Nucleic acid binder design. Structure first.
Ligand SMILES: CC[C@H](C)[C@H](N)C(=O)O
Ligand SMILES: [Mg+2]
Ligand SMILES: [Mg+2]
Ligand SMILES: [Mg+2]
Ligand SMILES: [Mg+2]
Ligand SMILES: [Mg+2]
Ligand SMILES: [Mg+2]
Ligand SMILES: [Mg+2]
Ligand SMILES: [Mg+2]
Ligand SMILES: [Mg+2]
Ligand SMILES: [Mg+2]
Ligand SMILES: [Mg+2]
Ligand SMILES: [Mg+2]
Ligand SMILES: [Mg+2]
Ligand SMILES: [Mg+2]
Ligand SMILES: [Mg+2]
Ligand SMILES: [Mg+2]
Ligand SMILES: [Mg+2]
Ligand SMILES: [Mg+2]
Ligand SMILES: [Mg+2]
Ligand SMILES: [Mg+2]
Ligand SMILES: [Mg+2]
Ligand SMILES: [Mg+2]
Ligand SMILES: [Mg+2]
Ligand SMILES: [Mg+2]
Ligand SMILES: [Mg+2]
Ligand SMILES: [Mg+2]
Ligand SMILES: [Mg+2]
Ligand SMILES: [Mg+2]
Ligand SMILES: [Mg+2]
Ligand SMILES: [Mg+2]
Ligand SMILES: [Mg+2]
Ligand SMILES: [Mg+2]
Ligand SMILES: [Mg+2]
Ligand SMILES: [Mg+2]
Ligand SMILES: [Mg+2]
Ligand SMILES: [Mg+2]
Ligand SMILES: [Mg+2]
Ligand SMILES: [Mg+2]
Ligand SMILES: [Mg+2]
Ligand SMILES: [Mg+2]
Ligand SMILES: [Mg+2]
Ligand SMILES: [Mg+2]
Ligand SMILES: [Mg+2]
Ligand SMILES: [Mg+2]
Ligand SMILES: [Mg+2]
Ligand SMILES: [Mg+2]
Ligand SMILES: [Mg+2]
Ligand SMILES: [Mg+2]
Ligand SMILES: [Mg+2]
Ligand SMILES: [Mg+2]
Ligand SMILES: [Mg+2]
Ligand SMILES: [Mg+2]
Ligand SMILES: [Mg+2]
Ligand SMILES: [Mg+2]
Ligand SMILES: [Mg+2]
Ligand SMILES: [Mg+2]
Ligand SMILES: [Mg+2]
Ligand SMILES: [Mg+2]
Ligand SMILES: [Mg+2]
Ligand SMILES: [Mg+2]
Ligand SMILES: [Mg+2]
Ligand SMILES: [Mg+2]
Ligand SMILES: [Mg+2]
Ligand SMILES: [Mg+2]
Ligand SMILES: [Mg+2]
Ligand SMILES: [Mg+2]
Ligand SMILES: [Mg+2]
Ligand SMILES: [Mg+2]
Ligand SMILES: [Mg+2]
Ligand SMILES: [Mg+2]
Ligand SMILES: [Mg+2]
Ligand SMILES: [Mg+2]
Ligand SMILES: [Mg+2]
Ligand SMILES: [Mg+2]
Ligand SMILES: [Mg+2]
Ligand SMILES: [Mg+2]
Ligand SMILES: [Mg+2]
Ligand SMILES: [Mg+2]
Ligand SMILES: [Mg+2]
Ligand SMILES: [Mg+2]
Ligand SMILES: [Mg+2]
Ligand SMILES: [Mg+2]
Ligand SMILES: [Mg+2]
Ligand SMILES: [Mg+2]
Ligand SMILES: [Mg+2]
Ligand SMILES: [Mg+2]
Ligand SMILES: [Mg+2]
Ligand SMILES: [Mg+2]
Ligand SMILES: [Mg+2]
Ligand SMILES: [Mg+2]
Ligand SMILES: [Mg+2]
Ligand SMILES: [Mg+2]
Ligand SMILES: [Mg+2]
Ligand SMILES: [Mg+2]
Ligand SMILES: [Mg+2]
Ligand SMILES: [Mg+2]
Ligand SMILES: [Mg+2]
Ligand SMILES: [Mg+2]
Ligand SMILES: [Mg+2]
Ligand SMILES: [Mg+2]
Ligand SMILES: [Mg+2]
Ligand SMILES: [Mg+2]
Ligand SMILES: [Mg+2]
Ligand SMILES: [Mg+2]
Ligand SMILES: [Mg+2]
Ligand SMILES: [Mg+2]
Ligand SMILES: [Mg+2]
Ligand SMILES: [Mg+2]
Ligand SMILES: [Mg+2]
Ligand SMILES: [Mg+2]
Ligand SMILES: [Mg+2]
Ligand SMILES: [Mg+2]
Ligand SMILES: [Mg+2]
Ligand SMILES: [Mg+2]
Ligand SMILES: [Mg+2]
Ligand SMILES: [Mg+2]
Ligand SMILES: [Mg+2]
Ligand SMILES: [Mg+2]
Ligand SMILES: [Mg+2]
Ligand SMILES: [Mg+2]
Ligand SMILES: [Mg+2]
Ligand SMILES: [Mg+2]
Ligand SMILES: [Mg+2]
Ligand SMILES: [Mg+2]
Lengths: 64, 51, 96, 76
RNA sequence: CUUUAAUGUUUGAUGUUCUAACGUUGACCCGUAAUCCGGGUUGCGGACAGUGUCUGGUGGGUAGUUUGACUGGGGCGGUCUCCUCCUAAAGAGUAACGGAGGAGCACGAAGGUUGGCUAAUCCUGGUCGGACAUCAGGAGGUUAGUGCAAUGGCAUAAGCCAGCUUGACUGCGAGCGUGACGGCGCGAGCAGGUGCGAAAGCAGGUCAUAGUGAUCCGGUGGUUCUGAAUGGAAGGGCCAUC
RNA sequence: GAACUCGCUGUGAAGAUGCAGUGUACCCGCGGCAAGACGGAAAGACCCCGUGAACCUUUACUAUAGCUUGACACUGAACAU
RNA sequence: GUUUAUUAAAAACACAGCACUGUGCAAACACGAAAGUGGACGUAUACGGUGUGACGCCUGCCCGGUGCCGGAAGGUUAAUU
RNA sequence: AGGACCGAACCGACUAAUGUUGAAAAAUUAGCGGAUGACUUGUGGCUGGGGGUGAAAGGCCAAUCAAACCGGGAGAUAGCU
RNA sequence: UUUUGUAUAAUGGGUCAGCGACUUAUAUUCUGUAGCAAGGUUAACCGAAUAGGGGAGCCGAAGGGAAACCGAGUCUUAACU
């Protein structure tokens, strides 16, 4: 039958204009007083998925 | 550790704040500092409060 | 997604965002699709009869994508600044 | 026994050698303490890292009354 | 407002009595040719006992499961994350239940800047005062000092004193180092607003390297976002934090 | 598995009828004995492993029959405290 | 006297006797969603459970721990309102 | 008189030898225990599997028992050979 | 066959003949090939039609932002060299 999407993966990745994926950085939910403001500033924007992980992400999102 | 977290609430009424630590046994005086409030873009007085 | 027991990638990263219900009743229209209507009056109902937008669509926009030659009238739809300059140069008009 | 544990290696040492062409902002050496000191067009970081403030060629020389080592940049 | 006796009000409870629900594995009559069952007369109890829904306690009687890895075989013992030195073969990296030690913090000053300053130890003289206290002179040259292990540094001091202070600042960032990845680190320069100094300048915590915990879930404050017929609201998103 | 199926010393997946060197030996039955063919008869029961079973125990975890407490319903009438 | 039919007949089980404990009869207890039935057409000189094991001489100290029995002045505490 | 004594039929099973591709999927030969009793035997009946029955060995329930046999979920699952 | 390594005294086979193990369906991505091309293609269904009709739909031609929204740009920020 039809393939089923991993519904928890669709909540975390978005496909961009050349076939890449963007995600949200980690380490910015929790325990924020002891972290430096320079470190927290650099974790605010979004980043792209690396080459090693593209194979695992694409398998989880067949209809993306 | 035995130090505890506090926060510095701005007096300009904007609602902005900072966070830092303190030990309340050897220094019971309230902390007061002049810092930069980014909502009003000025340096103003901040005062101790509770997390 | 299995990796041997290490926490997988789609589970050690945070979630974000929400889904907009108004984005599924909005469409965009091109300058090249602007001459396929009947009568030269570009309207929401004229675009549906031309198989240009979907039946459930309620809002539409015209963008600078393609070429426009004939003079046409746009009634009730949003237009960019770039598309508005090109429509006028062909002898058309935009009336909201 | 009561031995058994160590720590990770930090990958210190020289990254650019004499005569190399570098861009401004690149790192010449990583160190604990100033075993090399900063010369012309070279800055010192908070962890005693030396980096290029312009672009040119890396240079090593011994100078001063204590025979210490310096790193400089010879701009083009 | 203090405590008071009382008309009458809503009751709540604790006993007594009653019979009419309900119980009878007491006696008698009938269906009947019957130690089941049903109907009738009478005695004994009686709103109790007993049963349905909900609820606190007990419950290996019964049921479903869990009870780590490394390891000169397994068990017992020891270890499991982070920092420093050796092994490690003069770039980086490099194993063993190999050889030696530390961390799970501290500090609104022990942070910033301006001005100034230089150690341990020994000898001689000197009231109490002595091997060792404070004072004076001489030799010596860092053999001292770093908030806490070890290593690399430190006199232009990063070590020791004062005055003024909050840069332990908000938005970014050319270019580099290190990781399979998640991630971690260094950084001139630009915009706004500050402190010290006459200025040139310096300041985005502390001589550097340990002092730490992903995601899910929930809490607190703020918001030019969203709001299932419409106007609100509930809920969600974004920013700060637990 | 197929055989034209000797001893010794060495070697070798480390205890050889079959490899190397060497010694002995005409072809084939019958009655006997058990030293070897790591002889035959059961995918070792000892030991360890698998995020395999089964039964038993308890102050291991989570539940539950049974037992027990109270409120409401079947359930009414007076009187005095 | 009994026991592992098919590797164990024994010092193991049972026994007459002794003690503790529950039960007033629609008895306690047991089989059953229930109706019913055994106990028993019996009635504390009776019936059920547990331990010890003819007979003779005997059976000493501990209630702090675990279990069980009795009490309710006070503290905490469910559904309900 | 007697859960008395010796000993056949009858009911058992303590020792040795044989057999162990047996005459026999538990026997034969020579000895051995009880033999009026808690004895032994014929015909019919009742108790059903997480259940029964057990003078108690985890014993027995059709040569099968720390959970009988037949059919189904079912081509259960097998990081192992 | 399995192994670092087997003439191994490690596993399997007495021999012959017959049979005996990478499949089918539906989705998705890549390569070769054919048609048509800013376009490509129909499903159920109708039709006696392997013809013809049916364009409901799907993919592509525009992206950025959590979203409102803007659009060859957009987001970030009071604003960007
Ligand atoms: C609903 C919250 C759950 C339990 C989450 N995994 C925590 O822990
Ligand atoms: Mg947050
Ligand atoms: Mg789609
Ligand atoms: Mg784990
Ligand atoms: Mg359409
Ligand atoms: Mg080691
Ligand atoms: Mg190492
Ligand atoms: Mg040089
Ligand atoms: Mg009566
Ligand atoms: Mg009856
Ligand atoms: Mg009465
Ligand atoms: Mg009464
Ligand atoms: Mg009651
Ligand atoms: Mg048990
Ligand atoms: Mg159990
Ligand atoms: Mg299970
Ligand atoms: Mg182990
Ligand atoms: Mg051991
Ligand atoms: Mg060994
Ligand atoms: Mg070994
Ligand atoms: Mg070893
Ligand atoms: Mg080992
Ligand atoms: Mg073990
Ligand atoms: Mg061990
Ligand atoms: Mg252990
Ligand atoms: Mg080296
Ligand atoms: Mg080397
Ligand atoms: Mg070296
Ligand atoms: Mg190597
Ligand atoms: Mg190695
Ligand atoms: Mg100075
Ligand atoms: Mg030191
Ligand atoms: Mg230290
Ligand atoms: Mg220092
Ligand atoms: Mg200082
Ligand atoms: Mg000034
Ligand atoms: Mg520090
Ligand atoms: Mg300091
Ligand atoms: Mg330090
Ligand atoms: Mg360190
Ligand atoms: Mg180091
Ligand atoms: Mg509304
Ligand atoms: Mg809200
Ligand atoms: Mg031959
Ligand atoms: Mg032969
Ligand atoms: Mg011969
Ligand atoms: Mg030979
Ligand atoms: Mg030989
Ligand atoms: Mg030999
Ligand atoms: Mg040969
Ligand atoms: Mg030979
Ligand atoms: Mg040869
Ligand atoms: Mg030979
Ligand atoms: Mg030869
Ligand atoms: Mg002959
Ligand atoms: Mg012969
Ligand atoms: Mg012979
Ligand atoms: Mg033999
Ligand atoms: Mg042989
Ligand atoms: Mg054998
Ligand atoms: Mg076997
Ligand atoms: Mg085992
Ligand atoms: Mg495992
Ligand atoms: Mg009532
Ligand atoms: Mg018997
Ligand atoms: Mg018998
Ligand atoms: Mg036997
Ligand atoms: Mg005996
Ligand atoms: Mg017995
Ligand atoms: Mg009694
Ligand atoms: Mg009765
Ligand atoms: Mg009876
Ligand atoms: Mg009877
Ligand atoms: Mg009994
Ligand atoms: Mg006994
Ligand atoms: Mg006796
Ligand atoms: Mg006696
Ligand atoms: Mg006695
Ligand atoms: Mg006693
Ligand atoms: Mg007691
Ligand atoms: Mg009590
Ligand atoms: Mg007799
Ligand atoms: Mg006799
Ligand atoms: Mg026997
Ligand atoms: Mg024989
Ligand atoms: Mg006999
Ligand atoms: Mg006899
Ligand atoms: Mg007898
Ligand atoms: Mg006798
Ligand atoms: Mg019979
Ligand atoms: Mg039965
Ligand atoms: Mg069973
Ligand atoms: Mg069952
Ligand atoms: Mg046993
Ligand atoms: Mg049988
Ligand atoms: Mg059984
Ligand atoms: Mg079972
Ligand atoms: Mg079966
Ligand atoms: Mg199934
Ligand atoms: Mg199978
Ligand atoms: Mg084989
Ligand atoms: Mg091997
Ligand atoms: Mg070989
Ligand atoms: Mg062979
Ligand atoms: Mg061998
Ligand atoms: Mg052989
Ligand atoms: Mg071998
Ligand atoms: Mg092997
Ligand atoms: Mg073998
Ligand atoms: Mg072989
Ligand atoms: Mg064989
Ligand atoms: Mg064949
Ligand atoms: Mg295949
Ligand atoms: Mg396959
Ligand atoms: Mg391909
Ligand atoms: Mg199609
Ligand atoms: Mg098709
Ligand atoms: Mg289709
Ligand atoms: Mg068709
Ligand atoms: Mg249809
Ligand atoms: Mg149709
Ligand atoms: Mg179409
Ligand atoms: Mg259609
Ligand atoms: Mg479709
Ligand atoms: Mg821009």
């Amino acid at each position: 039958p039809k393939i089923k999407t991993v519904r928890g993966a669709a909540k975390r990745f978005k496909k961009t204009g050349k076939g890449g994926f963007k995600h949200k950085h980690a380490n910015l939910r929790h325990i924020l007083t002891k972290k430096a403001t320079k470190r927290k500033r650099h974790l605010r924007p979004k980043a792209m998925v690396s080459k090693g992980d593209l194979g695992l992400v694409i398998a989880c999102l067949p209809y993306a | 550790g035995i130090r505890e977290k506090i926060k510095l609430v701005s007096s300009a009424g904007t609602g902005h704040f900072y966070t830092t630590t303190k030990n309340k046994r050897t220094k019971p005086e309230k902390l007061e500092l002049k810092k930069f409030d980014p909502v009003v873009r000025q340096h103003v007085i901040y005062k101790e409060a509770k997390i | 997604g299995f990796e041997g027991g290490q926490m997988p990638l789609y589970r050690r990263l945070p979630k974000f965002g929400f889904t907009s219900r108004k984005a599924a009743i909005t469409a965009e229209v091109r300058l090249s699709d602007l001459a396929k209507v009947e009568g030269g009056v570009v309207d929401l109902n004229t675009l549906k009869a031309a198989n240009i937008i979907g039946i459930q669509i309620e809002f539409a926009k015209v963008i600078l994508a393609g070429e426009v030659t004939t003079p046409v009238t746009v009634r009730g739809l949003r237009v960019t600044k770039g598309a508005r300059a090109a429509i006028e140069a062909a002898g058309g008009k935009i009336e909201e | 026994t009561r031995n058994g544990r160590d720590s990770e290696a930090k990958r210190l040492g020289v990254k650019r050698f004499g005569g190399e062409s570098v861009l401004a902002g690149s790192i010449i050496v990583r160190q604990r303490g100033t075993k090399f000191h900063a010369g012309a067009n070279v800055g010192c970081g908070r962890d005693h890292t030396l980096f290029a403030k312009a672009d040119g060629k890396v240079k090593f020389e011994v100078k001063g009354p204590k025979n210490r080592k310096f790193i400089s940049i010879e701009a083009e």
